[PDB]
Amino acid sequence: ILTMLVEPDAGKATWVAASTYGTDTTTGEEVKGALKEIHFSTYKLAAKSFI
Amino acid sequence: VNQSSSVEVSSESYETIFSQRIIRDLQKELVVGALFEELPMSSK
Amino acid sequence: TDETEEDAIFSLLPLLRKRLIEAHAVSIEEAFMTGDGSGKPKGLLTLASED
């Protein structure tokens, strides 16, 4: 198997209002991302001949 | 796994070659972020 | 907040620190007068009532 990593999708940031200043959301919500994994594998093709 | 032969790898993690390559799609071209100029403001 | 500082033509932290030092001076004062004394300094006008 080969398991390369795929980067997660983009995150929007928050537009904070005037009244959340010096508050704790004045820095928005958190952009959480989660790397994901893709797998590569093989199958077999085969043949026989007899002379 | 690959248990075909006498002698087999223990977990299939000793099989896979984990890679550390990261890939991102065509990803929405961001057209309108920079088309317009800036007024560097210094007040509300 | 970072923003008020940017949203003012004037600086605004000189005031904070002054109004800061001042707040402490006033406070010792209000209390040294009539400070009940529970977690505040007891004061000359309540020290008197006590005596």
Curated annotation (Swiss-Prot), chain A:
It is found in: Virion. It comes from the Viruses. Interacts with the decoration protein; each hexon binds a single copy of the decoration protein. Interacts with the portal protein. Major capsid protein that self-associates to form 120 hexamers and 11 pentamers, building the T=13 icosahedral capsid which about 860 Angstroms in diameter. Responsible for its self-assembly into a procapsid. The phage does not need to encode a separate scaffolfing protein because its capsid protein contains the delta domain that carries that function. The capsid gains its final stability through the reorganization of the subunits that takes place upon expansion. DNA encapsidation through the portal triggers capsid expansion and the binding of the decoration protein to the capsid exterior. This is Major capsid protein. It comes from Escherichia phage T5.
